[PDB]
Structure formats: structure tokens, C-alpha cells
Design an enzyme around this catalytic site. Structure first.
Site, short mmCIF file in Angstrom:
data_model
loop_
_atom_site.label_atom_id
_atom_site.label_comp_id
_atom_site.label_asym_id
_atom_site.label_seq_id
_atom_site.Cartn_x
_atom_site.Cartn_y
_atom_site.Cartn_z
N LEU A 70 11.22 -19.93 -6.64
CA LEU A 70 10.07 -19.13 -5.97
C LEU A 70 8.82 -19.23 -6.47
O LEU A 70 8.61 -19.53 -7.71
CB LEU A 70 10.48 -17.61 -6.22
CG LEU A 70 9.41 -16.66 -5.36
CD1 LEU A 70 9.60 -16.74 -3.74
CD2 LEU A 70 9.79 -15.18 -5.79
N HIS A 113 1.89 4.04 -9.71
CA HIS A 113 1.96 2.86 -10.10
C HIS A 113 3.41 2.44 -10.84
O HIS A 113 3.72 1.24 -10.51
CB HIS A 113 0.72 2.73 -10.96
CG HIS A 113 -0.46 2.85 -10.10
ND1 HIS A 113 -1.74 3.36 -10.95
CD2 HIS A 113 -0.91 2.80 -8.84
CE1 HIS A 113 -2.53 3.40 -9.93
NE2 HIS A 113 -2.26 2.86 -8.81
N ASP A 137 0.81 -1.16 0.04
CA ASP A 137 0.18 -0.04 -0.10
C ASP A 137 0.92 1.10 -0.14
O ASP A 137 2.06 1.09 0.40
CB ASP A 137 -0.87 -0.05 1.33
CG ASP A 137 -2.06 1.09 1.30
OD1 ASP A 137 -2.35 1.84 0.25
OD2 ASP A 137 -2.43 1.25 2.47
#
Ligand SMILES: CCCCCCCCCCCCOc1cccc(O)c1C(=O)O
Ligand SMILES: CCCCCCCCCCCCOc1cccc(O)c1C(=O)O
Ligand SMILES: CCCCCCCCCCCCOc1cccc(O)c1C(=O)O
Lengths: 206, 222
Positions: free
Chosen positions: A104, A27, A10
Site C-alpha cells: 500500500l 484525537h 473529520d
């Protein structure tokens, strides 16, 4: 000992505003922060990284080849059933391409809610009951666990939320029963390797 | 709505053991001090306009047994005082395995205080957040099997109507004392939108000013 980290990313909008720039700019810088966090987790032996954008997916499918080269298994978690059909197929293809990878596991939440996740598993169980293939008294925590997102991966060990708020905001619920919760005021675009290591220490300290 | 905005506070009460150890005292002394801190927090919530206070005694055969002793003795000793302060008492958790005399004493304590109009006090006993979801799911599954419910009618609002405390205000604020930053399988479904407030203060030391600090942090962050 941290195997699976989840992050509520956030602060992109607030970062952009502090920069004197429009939302788009935050963004772009948030996407740079994703790449950095994914590299860091893959290079530090973390088994699974689960990322939630709090307040997109089309920006993402230009990165899949690079993930695949890095032996990352990509999964999207969330309700993609109403995405357009072409985007759904691109999601499916990207998952299929990397599904065999053993490095991963990167889970990207897309229209994900922790209550939604539970409800989707409960509906599956309800179908099974309606079919006569399951008794209500047979439903236990193991069984529900088997029908909620990420039941194949290591349990979530640590949840980091950047951006200053101290809430889960209906990200993972079932999955965080025993996770360490780490909140930092650092905004997501500024969250870097030192910040990630600091979270990993809170975990190891404890 | 009270100025602080908080209708329902849940508390993970941790730190009794560490508190007693720091004092060079055995566990029992931390438990006595922790009980005093429970009465103080209940009084505080009731006098500061909170609608509901939900308490969870963190612990982690002998564990079960110590937890039963705490519960049995509390139900014995504290219910008359709750009733005399207009508190409505509810137990949440899987009490189906308690012996039938204990389950009767829980029922009588709940019945006695059910018409009270002050604070609603929920005490977790053999409670887990995962268990809570699962019991709700089993209620829905029975409705499906007793042909009354279609799987595709099940939505979040419906499951919400089957978890503990659904009829009370949503939990606004979770406080955990004692320094750990974890939910430890307390409320899960119910804390999707709650403010999570962690303090290093050990439970026996958590007093009115700490509680006021947590509410004002809620008021300012919300
Ligand atoms: C929706 C799917 C898109 C999400 C992709 C997020 C962006 C991640 C792209 C990764 C760029 C390269 O990522 C690495 C990954 C693993 C190990 C690495 O060392 C690196 C490295 O660049 O050093
Ligand atoms: C299993 C049952 C456990 C319950 C334990 C909690 C018992 C608390 C005892 C009541 C303490 C008196 O608590 C008040 C409560 C509400 C309003 C009050 O004014 C007071 C006041 O002045 O003391
Ligand atoms: C003023 C006196 C305050 C003390 C009362 C407030 C806290 C009471 C919590 C009691 C927890 C009971 O919890 C169990 C009881 C029996 C069997 C159990 O397994 C458990 C279990 O949680 O695992």
C-alpha cells in the site's frame, strides 16, 4: 475496481464532545481509526490511501517500523518547508526507509491544500520558463499533472469525507476531476471497516 | 445578502437522456425538456437574489457535434430573452477553436448583455476545470517570459486572479442532478470551499422546489 482512496477525516472534536471528553480524547480515538483504516486498505488490495486531517505528525513517527514491516510506502504531501529541521529530517528518513516498499502507498497530508499543490507545480513551471527551458504554449494538462502531488500513483477513484460536511475544503482539487465523492455523517473515530466497505460499494454500484 | 446566503450557484445538469428513456422517447425530447428546465432555473435564480448562476451540460466527433448544435441553437434562440430579463451572459470554456463566425456571435451576445444588472449567467461550452487552471497558468507563464513576473511572486491569490469567473462572487454551492456523485472535470479550483449538493432528480424534473431545497440546505448547513 477501486485503486486509490482519499479520506477527509473529520469529526474527532465533535465525537469527543459527544463523549463528554476533551479534544485530546477524540484525537486518540481518531488515531485508532487511522490504524484500522490503513490495515483495512492494505488487507483489501487498495493501491493507495491518502488521508487528510480536517479541523499530529510527531505522534506518527512512532508507527513507521510497523508500516515498513507491512510493506507500506509512506509519503507525506503538503508544505513541510517551515516545519522544524529535525521533524523535516524525520519525515525524510521515514519516506526513505519505506520508499522501496511495494504494498500500500499511504500518503499523509501535512499542511496540505489543493490550491497550494497546484501553485507549487505552477511555480516549478514558472522557474523553467524563466530559465528559457519551457515555452508558455508548451504547458498542457499532462505537464501540469507531472508537477502536482501523487502523479506517480493510480488516479484517485474515490474520496470519502466523514463527519457530515459536504465540501472538499481545499483538499485535493486537480486530482479529483473524475473521482467518486462519498459523504457520510459517521464521525471519524467511529468510521470502521463496515463504513469503509459501504463507501467501496457506492463506488462499485456506480 | 439574500436570506439563503447563496451568491453563486453552479449546476451540473445531468439526467436528460435517462429522462427521455424512461418516457420511451428519443434523446431530442429529453433535450427539449432539459431546455425548459434551464429557462425555469435561470428565472428562479434571477428572482431569488442569486448573483451568478453557472451551468454545465454534462455529456460524458459526434459528441462534439451534438454539443455544438445545442450551443449554436441556444445562442441563436435565447439571447434576446436573456437581455429582456436583465441577465448578463458570459461563456466560459475554450472557445478558441470555434470558427470565427461563432466566436463573433458569442462576442456580440456577451457585448449586448454586458451592461445588464440582474443575474450573471455563465454557460460552460468546451469547458474543463483542468483546462481552466492550465489557461491561467499559461497567462502567468507569458508574464514570466515577457519579464513582468517573478516565479516566486506566484501565489494562490495570483493564480485565482487568472481562472474563469475570478471577478464574480466565489461559488458557494454546486448542485449536480441525475444521481452521479462526481465533479466530472467541471469547476475544480473554484470549488475548494463550495457546498456540494447531489440529487437523484433528473435534470428535466428539477424544478423551483428542488432549487429552493438546495438553497435552504445551503442556508442550514453553512
Ligand atoms: C505520519 C505517518 C504515521 C501514519 C501511520 C498511521 C498508523 C498506521 C500504523 C499501521 C499499524 C499496522 O498497520 C497495518 C498496515 C498494513 C497492513 C496491515 O495488515 C496492518 C495491520 O496492523 O494489520
Ligand atoms: C447560450 C445562451 C443560453 C441561455 C439559455 C437560458 C435562457 C433563459 C431564457 C430566459 C428565461 C426567462 O427567464 C427569466 C430570467 C430572469 C428573470 C426572469 O423573471 C425570467 C422569467 O420570468 O422567465
Ligand atoms: C434554453 C436552452 C438551454 C441550452 C443551453 C445551456 C447549455 C449549453 C451548453 C452547450 C455546451 C457546448 O459545449 C461544446 C460546444 C462545442 C464543442 C464542444 O467540444 C463542447 C464541449 O463542451 O465539449
Amino acid at each position: 475496481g477501486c485503486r486509490h482512496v482519499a479520506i477527509i477525516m473529520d469529526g474527532n472534536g465533535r465525537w469527543a464532545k459527544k463523549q463528554g471528553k476533551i479534544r485530546a480524547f477524540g484525537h486518540k480515538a481518531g488515531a485508532k481509526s487511522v490504524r484500522r483504516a490503513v490495515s483495512f486498505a492494505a488487507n483489501n488490495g487498495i493501491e493507495a490511501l491518502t488521508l487528510y486531517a480536517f479541523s499530529f505528525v510527531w505522534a506518527l513517527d512512532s508507527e513507521v517500523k510497523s508500516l515498513h514491516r507491512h510493506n507500506v510506502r509512506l509519503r507525506i504531501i503538503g508544505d513541510t518547508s517551515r516545519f522544524n529541521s529535525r521533524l523535516q529530517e524525520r519525515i525524510r528518513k521515514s519516506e526513505a526507509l519505506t520508499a522501496g516498499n511495494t504494498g500500500l502507498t499511504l500518503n499523509i497530508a501535512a499542511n496540505y491544500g489543493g490550491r497550494w499543490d497546484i501553485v507549487q507545480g505552477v511555480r516549478q513551471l514558472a522557474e523553467k520558463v524563466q530559465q528559457g527551458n519551457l515555452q508558455p504554449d508548451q504547458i498542457d494538462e499532462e505537464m501540469l499533472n507531472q508537477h502536482v502531488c501523487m502523479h506517480e500513483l493510480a488516479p484517485v477513484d474515490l474520496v470519502i469525507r466523514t463527519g457530515g460536511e459536504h465540501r472538499i475544503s481545499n483538499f485535493l482539487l486537480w486530482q479529483i476531476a473524475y473521482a467518486e465523492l462519498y459523504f457520510t455523517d459517521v464521525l471519524w473515530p467511529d468510521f470502521d471497516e463496515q463504513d469503509f466497505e459501504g463507501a467501496l460499494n457506492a463506488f462499485a454500484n456506480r
